[PDB]
């Protein structure tokens, strides 16, 4: 199916509390495989998944070099941002970068991302054409002009279509039995009396991978998209995910509601009805 | 461990202002300070600093290698662990040295540059500091009646460009630096595209560098050393008003474009 590779980087400045901190994580789909912390002792790109441990030392040296270069770069971009927004040098600020690519079942490129954010707001983003930049505010237009002058979008386009998708295919191959193995959601239902006239029905889904899943409640057929309560798909801690949906039902109409679960690992969507 | 910091800098002139802040237990709580000569002995007769320690006016005795400990009452020992070491160096003691750029302050991106700090005074320690973390250090080498050093800076990136100064210390008072040498600005050229050079009326005078890129400022220089804001033309082109010129962006004065082609 359609797979993805992402890199997320966070640079934070803590005046008086510590040194600037750079944490970087690499994900393929929903499985993290690399991390780099500027506060750990190794100072090297560390593996966080078994299917990537099989790479040679040339790989880790190259990746550690590039991620430490990014560490220094974003550490300085914090200071440059201080002057872009004329901010005090005593406040704490955040700089985030999301980079990556998508491929399809054909193994060919689909979409590439290279975006930045400052203090949680969008900063500069790479358009899907991979040739122009979207600057949110004025400070981002400054960077956009510098970047158009350095011909960076061309280099990024070469990298997004070149090393990025080739590496993504290699990652999907090296852990085929890990990343291309879907796990079905195990489902059950719980019933709790909200009061004498109404109760709450909760349909669970545990131990599913990837984290994509759909839980929908239906009363006599039609959906309750607004009468339902959804929580965020949460990790179990072992590469599987959990989710549940809860709807409040009048006491006696429990037979009129039902929950439908749709997931990639399920050959056919599941219909669950609550019985005493 | 606590975190020890110096505001505004650990390189402070005498009579200036400096402040040691000790962050422990998510607070600038009460702390005790220590020097390297007396590791397990608190300074100032075991003074417990309620607020942060402002060392202004900064004197000579105020320099050295410090570490703090915060108050952890619910622990075996009454205090924390040893914090990160912080070296306060006071400047303005001896005479200023000299700082030269070899081959020049206009460094090409990814290339190297040697900042040579020298003086007739046989300074034993030479220190190089960019105008904002821990400074670099090299021992002075005596030759031809003067002490010199060769600070290598590179490969050139936007983070390594800025105002550099270099200081000298005597053999038995290392934390007391000489006066700051004259500030040397090291600017990086590139990777921004080079502009085009033109000088009405002709080469027989007013600057005029044009480029499609919206450079905020054009800088000009000839073979011998001896700013200029820009504006767009009707062709949207940003023009200005052996010669060479560079393009620069506002708030980024130490990062220039590639050199324009040399013109007669």
């Amino acid at each position: 199916g359609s797979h993805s590779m992402r890199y997320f980087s966070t640079s934070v400045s803590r005046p008086g509390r510590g040194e600037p901190r750079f944490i970087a994580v690499g994900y393929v789909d929903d499985t993290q495989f690399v991390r780099f912390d500027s506060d750990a002792a190794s100072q090297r790109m560390e593996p966080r998944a078994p299917w990537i441990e099989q790479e040679g030392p040339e790989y880790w040296d190259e990746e550690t070099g590039k991620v430490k270069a990014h560490s220094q770069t974003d550490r300085e971009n914090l200071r440059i941002a201080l002057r872009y927004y004329n901010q005090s040098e005593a406040g704490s600020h955040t700089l985030q970068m999301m980079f990556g690519c998508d491929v399809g079942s054909d193994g060919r490129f689909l979409r590439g991302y290279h975006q930045y954010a400052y203090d949680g707001k969008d900063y500069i983003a790479l358009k899907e054409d991979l040739r122009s930049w979207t600057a949110a505010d004025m400070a981002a237009q400054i960077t956009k002009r510098k970047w158009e002058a350095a011909h960076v979008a061309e280099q990024q386009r070469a990298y997004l279509e070149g090393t990025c998708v080739d590496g993504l295919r290699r990652y999907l191959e090296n852990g085929k039995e890990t990343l291309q193995r879907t796990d079905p959601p195990k489902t059950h239902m719980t019933h709790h009396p909200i009061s004498d006239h109404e109760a709450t029905l909760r349909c669970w889904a545990l131990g599913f991978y990837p984290a994509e899943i759909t839980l929908t409640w239906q009363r006599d057929g039609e959906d309750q998209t607004q009468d339902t309560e959804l929580v965020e798909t949460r990790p179990a801690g072992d590469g599987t995910f959990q989710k549940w949906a809860a709807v409040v039902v009048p006491s006696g109409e429990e037979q009129r509601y039902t929950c439908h679960v749709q997931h990639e690992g399920l050959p056919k969507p599941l219909t669950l009805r609550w019985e005493p | 461990k606590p975190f020890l910091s110096a505001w505004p800098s650990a390189v402070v002139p005498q009579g200036g202002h400096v402040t040691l802040r000790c962050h422990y237990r998510h607070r600038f709580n009460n702390f005790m300070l220590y020097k390297e000569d007396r590791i397990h002995i608190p300074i100032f007769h075991g003074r417990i600093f309620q607020e942060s320690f402002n060392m202004s006016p900064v004197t000579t005795a105020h320099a050295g290698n410090y570490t703090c400990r915060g108050s952890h009452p619910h622990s075996p020992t009454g205090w924390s662990a040893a914090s990160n070491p912080v070296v306060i160096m006071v400047t303005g003691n001896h005479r200023k040295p000299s700082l030269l750029a070899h081959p020049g302050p206009l460094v090409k991106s990814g290339e190297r540059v040697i900042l040579q700090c020298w003086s007739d005074i046989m300074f034993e320690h030479f220190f190089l500091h960019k105008e904002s973390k821990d400074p670099s250090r090299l021992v002075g080498q005596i030759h031809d009646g003067v002490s010199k050093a060769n600070f290598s800076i590179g490969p050139m990136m936007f983070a390594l460009a800025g105002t550099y100064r270099c200081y000298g210390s005597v053999t038995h008072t290392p934390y007391q630096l000489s006066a700051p040498s004259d500030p040397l600005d090291i600017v990086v050229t590139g990777p921004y595209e080079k502009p085009s050079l033109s000088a009405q009326p002709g080469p027989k005078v007013t600057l005029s560098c044009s480029s499609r890129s919206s450079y905020d400022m054009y800088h000009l220089s000839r073979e011998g050393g001896a700013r200029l804001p820009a504006v767009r033309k009707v062709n949207r082109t940003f023009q200005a008003d052996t010669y060479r010129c560079f393009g620069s962006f506002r708030h980024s004065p130490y990062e220039w474009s590639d050199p324009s082609d040399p013109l007669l």
């Binding site: 970087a24 590039k66 990014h70 300085e76 | -």
Partner: peptide, 8 residues
């Protein structure tokens, strides 16, 4: 593979 990042 980690990208190539540039200064702001």
């Amino acid at each position: 593979r980690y990208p190539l990042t540039f200064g702001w």
